[PDB]
Amino acid sequence: AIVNSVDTMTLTNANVSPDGFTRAGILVNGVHGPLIRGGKNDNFELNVVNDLDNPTMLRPTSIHWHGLFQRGTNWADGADGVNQCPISPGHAFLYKFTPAGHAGTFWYHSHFGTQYCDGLRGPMVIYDDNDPHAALYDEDDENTIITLADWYHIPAPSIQQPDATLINGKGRYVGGPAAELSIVNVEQGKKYRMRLISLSCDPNWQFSIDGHELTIIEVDGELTEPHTVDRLQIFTGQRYSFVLDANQPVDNYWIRAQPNKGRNGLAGTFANGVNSAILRYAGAANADPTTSANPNPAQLNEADLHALIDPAAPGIPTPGAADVNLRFQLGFSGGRFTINGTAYESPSVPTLLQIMSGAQSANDLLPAGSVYELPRNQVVELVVPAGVLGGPHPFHLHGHAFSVVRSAGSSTYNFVNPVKRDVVSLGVTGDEVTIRFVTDNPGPWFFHCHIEFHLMNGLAIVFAEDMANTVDANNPPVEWAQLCEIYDDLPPEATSIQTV
């Protein structure tokens, strides 16, 4: 169950039934989404061995280590088509990188097509030896992690709405068997750093724990001042650490994660234990909770979250006064999502290899219309107005965390101490989510909607950041460029997809 910072991750197919329904899925070292853990200065060496052979799911793979900036290791970032070609079935690839002092709650997932929706994803926690919030809790370990995952009864390639919400890999579907629910154990009077992670391919969840508050202290691998709420909405790939103060009577309490969509009314109920897990106090019975949610919760508003360390947003504290000011117009036309009129389509040679081969400017890079060059060591402000169908769209920027100077639902800006994070919901029509970051990381980085079906239908762009220093900054192993030659040589039967 635990993958260490130096380890092997062997990918196989197996039949799984996390909600009591059996289907074929993907395992990592014989386990469903095992935790990867390490320390902030660790030199990670993860040999990803692709032994996938079930043709009803994608077989080639690529792993993204979500939230790690990968400075100087752009070739390990994992987005197929941008940072590497996929690792082919029967071959392996050794990713090497370091958090470089960046502690936090992260997650890993395939970044090849919609494969992570089939289960190739898991939590990744990087602990700090000098954590600023250490006095606020007693415990923080493999038992204080709470993952949320959308689970479908049909393999991703054959999707025509989630059948279940899995909490720590377990959950029920409407009309399903009374499958075992996950248990989070706590002892009255103790305080826990609970690390809540969305492994979602699509849905967002309204998360709450009956009788308890959530004291948020970390957001997407970035510390915040402690901000307490009763309920929060968490979007694809976001993470929150909240201190859970086990200050209620010894009892069982429902953990609730209500999705925005789902089959057979899953979005609107908790009946029969769907969308649920159990918080059990030591001494309480081996039984389900009979608790109810707070009927008047304080709901998280992202604009209330404030960065703790180096809080100021970069640049002149005036909207549109960054060094580089980009406004992106999302669209949906002719069956595909577009950004500034162009639907993202993966190139035949991954962006980083295009640059290592000689591309000097964005004009030389493919695909045309999807690549935006950024200069070195400048402040970039991106404005991405909501409105395009299928929202709310949670966009994620690889290579950087950003300050959200203007969140959804707010008309106000905060340049003094806005929250920093790496996935942000663009909100609804009228919202103009605005984020800032510094171009301190040479290499090509994806910027896209993390709803996997949207990314696959075109909602993405690539930033070719500091092209001139990209070759000097990054030194891929010889096996990295060899991925594309091995991949491009694959016979038709090695990549065929059996629809079911």
How far apart, in whole angstroms, are the C-alpha atoms of residue 125 and residue 42? 12
Contacts of 264 (CB under 8 A, 6+ apart): 173, 174, 175
Ligand-binding site membership of 449 (annotated): yes
**Min dist. Cβ of residue 69 to Cu ion (A):** 13
> By C-beta, is 414 or 474 nearer to Cu ion?
474
Q: Looking only at residues 144 through 173 of this chain, which bind Cu ion when binding is defined by CB under 5 A?
A: none
Residue-wise DSSP of 128-141:
-TT-TTGGG-SB-S
- The 220-259 contact track toward Cu ion, x by CB under 5 A, reads -----------------x----------------------
Question: Min. distance of Cβ 451 from Cu ion in angstroms?
Answer: 4
Q: Are 104 and 222 in contact (CB under 8 A)?
A: yes
Q: Does 393 interact with Cu ion (rule: CB under 5 A)? A: yes
Instruction: Choose between 107 and 253: whose C-beta lies nearer to Cu ion.
Output: 107
- Using the contact rule CB under 5 A, the part of the chain among 136-144, 222-230, 449-457, 476-484 near Cu ion is 449-457
Smallest separation, CB 66 to Cu ion (Å): 4
Task: Put residue 389 in one of left, alpha, beta given phi > 0 → left and psi -120 to 50 → alpha.
Answer: beta
Shortest separation between residue 186's beta carbon and Cu ion, angstroms = 29
Candidate segments 127-135, 352-360, 386-394, 424-432, binder of Cu ion by CB under 5 A: 386-394
Quick check: 352 binds Cu ion (CB under 5 A)? no
Nearer to Cu ion, 209 or 449 (CB): 449
Q: 370 with 462: CB under 8 angstroms?
A: yes
Q: How far is the CB of 14 from Cu ion (least distance, A)?
A: 23
Q: Which two tokens stand for residue 493?
A: 């039967």
Is there a binding annotation on residue 448?
yes
Question: Minimum distance between the CB of residue 141 and Cu ion, rounded to whole angstroms?
Answer: 23
Tokens of 240: 């929150």
DSSP letters for 190-201 = -EEEEEEEE--S
Q: Which helix (H) or strand (E) holds 7?
A: strand 6-16
66 appears as a binding residue in the annotation: yes
Which CB sits closer to Cu ion, 253 or 344?
A: 344
Tally the residues of the chain: 500
Q: Which span sits near Cu ion by CB under 5 A: 168-176, 294-302, 307-315, 439-447? A: 439-447
Beta bridge partners of 207: 232, 257
Size of residue set near Cu ion by CB under 5 A? 7
Q: Which of 48, 57, 449, 461 binds Cu ion (CB under 5 A)?
A: 449
212 has binding-site annotation:
no
Q: Which is nearer to Cu ion, 116 or 281 (CB)?
A: 116
- Residue nearer to Cu ion on the CB measure, 237 or 347: 237
**Bridge partners of residue 94, in order along the sequence:** 47
Bridge partners of 448? Answer: 396, 460
Phi, psi of 487 (to 5 degrees): -65, -45
Among 68, 128, 61, which residue's Cα sits nearest to residue 91?
61
Under 8 Å CB-to-CB from 344, ≥6 apart: which residues?
Answer: 337, 367, 370, 448, 455, 458, 459, 460, 461
Of 446, 463, 480, 487, which one interacts with Cu ion (CB under 5 A)?
446
CB of 455 to Cu ion, least distance (A): 7
Which residue lies nearer to Cu ion by CB, 204 or 276? 204
Q: Are strands 371-374 and 460-465 parallel, antiparallel or unpaired?
A: parallel
Side-chain half-sphere of 482: how many Cα atoms within 13 Å? Answer: 7
Min dist. Cβ of residue 253 to Cu ion (A): 30
Composition of the chain by helix, strand, coil, percent to 5: 10, 40, 50
Closest contact distance (angstroms) between CB of 78 and Cu ion is 8
* In the complex, least distance from residue 64 CB atom to Cu ion, rounded to whole angstroms: 5
Q: Per-residue string for binding with Cu ion, 450-469, x by CB under 5 A?
A: -x--x---------------
CA angle (351 as vertex; 347, 355 as ends), nearest 5? 130
Asked if 427 interacts with Cu ion (CB under 5 A), we say: no
Interacting positions 47-86 with Cu ion (CB under 5 A): 66
Where helices occur in 345-460 by DSSP H, the ranges are: 351-357, 452-456
Strand (E) positions, 251-365? Answer: 252-259, 276-281, 324-327, 330-333, 336-339
Q: Identify which of residues 446 and 480 has a Cβ nearer to Cu ion in the complex.
A: 446
Is residue 109 marked as binding? yes
Nearer to Cu ion among residue 38 and residue 67 (C-beta): 67
Which of 289, 399 has the CB closer to Cu ion?
399
Which residues, numbered 104-143, are part of the site for Cu ion (CB under 5 A)? none
- Residue 450 annotated as binding? yes
101 touches 40 (CB < 8 A) = yes
- Alpha carbons 221 and 420: distance in angstroms, whole number: 9
Chain contacts with Cu ion (rule: CB under 5 A): 66, 237, 393, 446, 449, 451, 454
Residues comprising the binding site?
Answer: 66, 109, 111, 393, 396, 398, 448-450, 454
Residues comprising the binding site for Cu(2+)?
Answer: 66, 109, 111, 393, 396, 398, 448-450, 454
